[PDB]
Design a protein around this ligand. Structure first.
Ligand code: HEM
Ligand code: HEM
Ligand code: HEM
Ligand code: HEM
Ligand SMILES: OC[C@H]1O[C@](O)(CO)[C@@H](O)[C@@H]1O
Lengths: 137, 146, 138, 146
């Protein structure tokens, strides 16, 4: 909805320079809560301080800022990521639900004033729309 | 559900700070806003037409309290969730006809509310322990459907 | 995909005059396998021969033929059904997966020559798309 | 998994006519076509690039036969699925890390395959009984997740 797009842009726009920190936290939350997700990263250091998890967190978070900026046009904007996640990596669509949940948990923990019920709803819809695109092929 | 001793006392420690009353109604309210088909089960609760109406509805609050009380029974009996929830599993299936996927959704909404309240203190290892618990609760509630 | 649209139009087009019979069978399969679904039908006779289930099966099956004819355009063509299923009835999205599975089982049992692996894949995608549309106010 | 005596003998009667050398490969093959991410777990099986390659692949067929054999063990021991599938749960959960939602998908593909082969004889009541069986198998395979 138009109100969903407004709520996502407002909430996500207040991530700012913490993008990499939050992406890395979300990944860590996922790897500890749902350990089957670790098999997609067989050659990563997944220990708590990892430079590799922080670098990867930044990429994930920056792809989400790009999805925010192209909300109306996501199949086209995330095209190469759909290639990667669906055609090359073959990621089970369950895992997108799992990361989406860990992203919301991360935003709830860091931006409590922003994470109202309406914003939670909007963010949840947005992350599901990003996940269909990424698994769509 | 198999928790380590470490995990067990992190869960118990965090739950001691939970306002029994208020979190249940927040969790239940967010379920009804984020997953609106769940409102079908609560038509007699009155006004649910907007997020603010849902969160400020006194029946959502009062029913929230009951839901969260059953979660606390769970935490007290982690080696016996199926037994603890046996009568409630019956009720949700035979009497209310709730699809069990909805049990998983509430559990995760409750996780988001805990994170919302506790911020930094809801660390990733603490989340992991709670995810085992709410999965165990959802599975136990689904047990008498089969 | 274009090959998905071809496979759906070919397989479904062979339903022909059996549309009602197959929609009714699929509903019966759903009610027996997944009895939580029966609450959405408060006064219906849901026994095996039911005239009510046969009438309802025909509507469901005819909406699917209409979805097949408007594959490129489903949000607009199924607009009133989304109103009904998502705003008024508040049908849990799980139940669309349940009926979709039962429709595939029904087609496998009646049209074995048509239900190749490729066609099965295409049909499964088509029914998931129809389900997204019907639950899309969520 | 709790079946009626009626349901029990309708399941055993139908299964006696199942070609143990074929149906497993048909079920597995259709899993890999319909739900292509499942191919991740079968890279060593060689050619899976098209539907015809999948269905005519001798390793899908040979592995399909083993999968079907475990379903038969299940049918012989419906009051003890958890025990029957305990070492396979270890394998699929602790060693392979297969997401359990994929166990529910295979079970349903197998149901479509039984329908394909038996036509009119795969009646709705017969399906309803097989849905209970395949859910019971999926839940037993997942035992080590929860
Ligand atoms: C909203 C969700 C997600 C976003 C925005 C996202 C974004 C990205 C980005 C930007 C890259 C690397 C860019 C590049 O190399 O071109 C990538 C790679 C990857 N993603 Fe995701 N991703 C998401 C979800 C997931 C999930 C759920 C998994 C689950 C296992 C996953 C697994 C991977 C893997 C394995 C790589 C390869 C990275 C490497 O080997 O270095 N992603 N993703
Ligand atoms: C997953 C954790 C859940 C727990 C622990 C839980 C627990 C309970 C409890 C304790 C009651 C009241 C029992 C009594 O006093 O007899 C109840 C009633 C109810 N539950 Fe749940 N429940 C859960 C999830 C759900 C979900 C997801 C739904 C619907 C989507 C649901 C719908 C209801 C309904 C409709 C009632 C009856 C409310 C009324 O009086 O109108 N429950 N539940
Ligand atoms: C492919 C999926 C589906 C299709 C194409 C479909 C199609 C339809 C159609 C054509 C109608 C009648 C419209 C009218 O003339 O008023 C309708 C009504 C209905 N649908 Fe569905 N539907 C689907 C899935 C579901 C599911 C999964 C459920 C419940 C489990 C459901 C429950 C109903 C109910 C309760 C009605 C109202 C019937 C009455 O009381 O008269 N539908 N649907
Ligand atoms: C749901 C019912 C299933 C049953 C009854 C079943 C049964 C089995 C059996 C009997 C074996 C071989 C045992 C042995 O010889 O050591 C096995 C291996 C395997 N299963 Fe399954 N399975 C099921 C589901 C799945 C699913 C859904 C996947 C999805 C990708 C999967 C992937 C595998 C893999 C990769 C192997 C290893 C075989 C090898 O290395 O040769 N299984 N399964
Ligand atoms: O702990 C998970 C449990 O869930 C059940 O359905 C009950 C069993 O199959 C299994 O032991």
């Amino acid at each position: 909805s138009p109100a969903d797009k407004t709520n996502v842009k407002a909430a996500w726009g207040k991530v700012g320079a913490h993008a990499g920190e939050y992406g890395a936290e979300a990944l860590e939350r996922m790897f500890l809560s749902f350990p089957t997700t670790k098999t997609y990263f067989p050659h990563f250091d997944l220990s708590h301080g990892s430079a590799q998890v922080k670098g990867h967190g930044k990429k994930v978070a920056d792809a989400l800022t790009n999805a925010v900026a192209h909300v109306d046009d996501m199949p086209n904007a995330l095209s190469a990521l759909s290639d990667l996640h669906a055609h090359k990596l073959r990621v089970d669509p369950v895992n997108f639900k799992l990361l989406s949940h860990c992203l919301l948990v991360t935003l709830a923990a860091h931006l409590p004033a922003e994470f109202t019920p309406a914003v939670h709803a909007s963010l949840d819809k947005f992350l599901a729309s990003v996940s269909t695109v990424l698994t769509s092929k | 559900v198999h928790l380590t001793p470490e995990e067990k006392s992190a869960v118990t420690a965090l739950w001691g700070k939970v306002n029994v009353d208020e979190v249940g109604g927040e969790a239940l309210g967010r379920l009804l806003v984020v997953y609106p088909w769940t409102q079908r089960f609560f038509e007699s609760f009155g006004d649910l037409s907007t997020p603010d109406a849902v969160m400020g509805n006194p029946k959502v609050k009062a029913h929230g309290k009951k839901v969260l009380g059953a979660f606390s029974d769970g935490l007290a009996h982690l080696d016996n969730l199926k037994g603890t929830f046996a009568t409630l599993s019956e009720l949700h299936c035979d009497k209310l006809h709730v699809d069990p996927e909805n049990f998983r959704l509430l559990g995760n909404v409750l996780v988001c509310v805990l994170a919302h309240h506790f911020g930094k203190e809801f660390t990733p290892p603490v989340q992991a322990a709670y995810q085992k618990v709410v999965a165990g609760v959802a599975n136990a509630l689904a047990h008498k459907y089969h």
